[PDB]
Amino acid sequence: NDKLTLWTTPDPSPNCKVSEEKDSKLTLVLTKCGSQILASVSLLVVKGKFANINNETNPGEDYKKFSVKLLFDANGKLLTGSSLDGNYWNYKNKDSVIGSPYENAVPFMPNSTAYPKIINNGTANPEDKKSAAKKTIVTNVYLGGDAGQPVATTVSFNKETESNCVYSITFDFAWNKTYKNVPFDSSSLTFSYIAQDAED
Amino acid sequence: NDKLTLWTTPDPSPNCKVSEEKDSKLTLVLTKCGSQILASVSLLVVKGKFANINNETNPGEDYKKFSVKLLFDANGKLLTGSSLDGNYWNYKNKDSVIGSPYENAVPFMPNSTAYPKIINNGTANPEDKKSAAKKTIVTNVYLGGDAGQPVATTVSFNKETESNCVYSITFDFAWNKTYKNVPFDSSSLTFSYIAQDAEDK
Amino acid sequence: NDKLTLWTTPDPSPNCKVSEEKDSKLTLVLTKCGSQILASVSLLVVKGKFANINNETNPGEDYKKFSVKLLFDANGKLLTGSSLDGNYWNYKNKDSVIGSPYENAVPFMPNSTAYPKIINNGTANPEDKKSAAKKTIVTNVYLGGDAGQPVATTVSFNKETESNCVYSITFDFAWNKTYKNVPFDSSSLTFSYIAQDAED
Ligand SMILES: CC(=O)N[C@H]1[C@H]([C@H](O)[C@H](O)CO)O[C@](O)(C(=O)O)C[C@@H]1O
Ligand SMILES: CC(=O)N[C@H]1[C@H]([C@H](O)[C@H](O)CO)O[C@](O)(C(=O)O)C[C@@H]1O
Ligand SMILES: CC(=O)N[C@H]1[C@H]([C@H](O)[C@H](O)CO)O[C@](O)(C(=O)O)C[C@@H]1O
């Protein structure tokens, strides 16, 4: 009933494509403390490529990394082409989701002044040079909650331009370890980014 | 606000068992940002095993790791099996604590739908309760605030079962380094977890 | 919103001294969720020592680390002697700043009970033993948002005593890598600390 938490469900049914359709349950919770967004996120791949990682028999790089994209329009609606199905992605209602799909959700989108879409011109003066890293959180999650099973995790904001998105949260994942029969089950990751809002 | 912050005191007197009774000050602050909980946490061992770590003379594993449990009931009261003494664990009032002990504190407990108590072992076709990792935050703290002194730190939610707990915040700590005369003084760690609600009315 | 979020601008003009004057844009956002402060922070060095790090030709330590201080008075005003210029450091209003400079900002300062001014200890009684680490967050940021480019990052609270400061947020940065032509462009870092104010 609180309008201040866009999320999946806390315990979601398969609602995310990783390597196929409905590959994986992605738990993502955006709580809007002031002008910033507090977010935790776990990923669990239940079937397909990364449901039981083995790089002993699959040493290839395509088997040692993947990416999850959330694509949003100017209203901040989740698009098709997002890795995340939008059926069970809405504002909170007890442990579940609100009856109607959400019309507007800009307050929750990354700031397009803080995290601008990169531009396609070559010239750039000292003060007018924009940043790639600014739009980035690089960290680790840990498969199975084992500290010896690190995945390099890269949250990116308004990185994507897919399906004519205006805002884009992107979780990239990669590892060096040659994991043997290790389900991709990520530890919860806490992070924040600066939001947008607009009047009318 | 004061009613939105369960914690110890900012500067607590020895209030945590690590290897023996009140042998460490644990600073923990739960602030309830919407449906999530924002938390920072430092640990300082003042006496006993880990008050001055040396693995040169104590190479044994029992001397290179330990765990601190907070056990809660369905109301969210701290239970006896807890590593943390409950005298100075309550809602905030200035840099101190509220007059009466707290009756209810569920809003602050980890979500038992997101972090369910029981774990399923063996088979995994559905795999629907099958996340161990979801209930986990793995990171590092740094003894003395020195970047060369990492402790592998594992926050767990509703992991524990002891004393008939319903909710359980659990901080495990372990290290590979052979530390020589290094007090266990952890750098403050920021983290969040998904909370619980309170029925309807 | 106003009074709830002390910050720079989301996209700041050069407003930070690192090795010389206004040689870097530092983006810092303090949002006061309850009794804690939520903060993200990116640093971008546009000119001078760290604008294009090379430790192949500059192996010296002075070229492999630096520190950024914010020094505050009892009111919580940013002082000269801070690395951060105070012109465009104020309470939020849209993507910009409030008209007048801010009179009071204690609610945003680190807790002087949790992070005491104490640093010299003459005795050390078991129950009255004070903590250095408590005042510390040690983590990593990642230059260019590349996971292979770690900087050891140390946030410290009420560490500093310079210019007779009462409160002090301090970001130290250091690296072991011998980086070749690597701009100091940090990935956004999320963190929190304890903060109070009270009076009549
Ligand atoms: C950083 C962290 O938290 N975990 C790390 C663990 C633990 O420190 C501990 O050694 C496990 O027992 O060590 C590694 O496996 C290692 O040294 O190769 C890297 C891993 O990232
Ligand atoms: C905060 C952090 O990650 N610190 C890490 C440092 C940094 O790389 C630092 O710059 C140089 O010590 O490296 C280690 O000391 C190391 O390799 O053994 C481990 C430690 O966890
Ligand atoms: C986010 C993270 O973990 N970064 C770390 C990377 C990643 O493992 C990366 O994927 C491989 O470059 O490893 C190091 O570069 C390394 O091994 O020396 C240290 C660095 O801090």
Author numbering:
A (entry chain C), C (entry chain A): 183 to 382
B (entry chain B): 183 to 383
From the article:
Each protein forms key interactions to promote cell infection, with the terminal domain of the fiber, the fiber knob protein, interacting with the viruses’ primary cell entry receptor. The adenovirus fiber knob protein is known to have a highly conserved trimeric structure. Sialic acid (SA) usage has been proposed as a cell infection mechanism for EKC causing HAdV-D. Here we highlight an important role for SA engagement by many HAdV-D. We provide apo state crystal structures of 7 previously undetermined HAdV-D fiber-knob proteins, and structures of HAdV-D25, D29, D30 and D53 fiber-knob proteins in complex with SA. Our findings demonstrate a conserved binding site for sialic acid, common across the species D adenoviruses, therefore suggesting that, along with CAR, the receptor can be used to initiate cell entry.
HAdV-D15, D24 and D32 were crystallised in only their apo states, whereas HAdV-D25, D29, D30 and D53 crystals were also soaked with sialic acid. This resulted in four structures of HAdV-D25, D29, D30 and D53 in complex with sialic acid also shown in Fig. 1. The conformation of the bound sialic acid was found to be a mixture of the α and β anomers, freely exchangeable in solution and minimal protein side chain adjustment was required to accommodate either conformation. Soaking in sialic acid containing solutions reduced resolution slightly. Whilst the threonine was not found to be universally conserved, the other species D adenoviruses had similar sized residues which generally made interactions with sialic acid in HAdV-D29, D30 and D53. However, the four sialic acid soaked novel crystal structures, provide a much more reliable view of the binding pocket and interactions with sialic acid.
